[PDB]
């Protein structure tokens, strides 16, 4: 259960994602229901960027015991958007100033 999930989180991550998330719910060799999360990286959960940047899909894997639920969540690097807001609305980047050379008495040039 972990090897298969943990590997998928690695292939998604290795493929340039900002974050991933895998949920397995159901019953697996025991009689009682359990559920694990496998999530590495960065993922937002609220607001419009959800519609923009995270991809959700659930699948029902039907096994001889019962039926598990696979849920996957992939968060794409917004910098590569290529048709979008290129970042999260939180991103407030300041440009850095440049060192100036002071006083230098007036000395106007000509052309």
């Amino acid at each position: 259960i972990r090897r298969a999930a943990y590997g998928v989180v690695r292939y998604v991550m290795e493929s340039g994602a900002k974050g991933c998330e895998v949920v397995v719910s159901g019953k697996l060799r025991a009689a009682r229901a359990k559920a694990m999360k496998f999530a590495d990286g960065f993922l937002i959960h609220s607001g419009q960027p959800v519609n923009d940047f995270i991809d959700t899909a659930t699948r029902h894997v039907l096994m001889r015991q019962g039926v598990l639920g696979i849920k996957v969540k992939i968060m794409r690097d917004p910098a590569k958007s290529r048709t979008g807001p290129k970042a999260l609305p939180d991103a407030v980047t300041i440009i850095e100033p440049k060192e100036e050379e002071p006083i230098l008495a007036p000395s106007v040039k000509d052309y």
Binding site: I1, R2, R3, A4, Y6, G7, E14
Partner: protein, 57 residues
């Protein structure tokens, strides 16, 4: 899974992703009985396959 064997999980999962990354990169550069069944009934539509005669009394 028990956390007592978790190391052997993250390694065999990574090794899986290693194989999934090789199959993904090797598949990036890798290496007629016509007879017209719909018309074979119109081709073999020749005669000598019937019989019809009736109406006595």
């Amino acid at each position: 899974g028990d956390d007592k064997k978790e190391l052997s999980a993250e390694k065999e999962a990574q090794a899986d992703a290693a194989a999934e990354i090789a199959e993904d990169a090797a598949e990036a550069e890798d290496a007629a009985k016509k007879v017209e069944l719909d018309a074979e009934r119109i081709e073999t539509a020749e005669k000598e396959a019937y019989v019809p005669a009736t109406k006595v009394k």
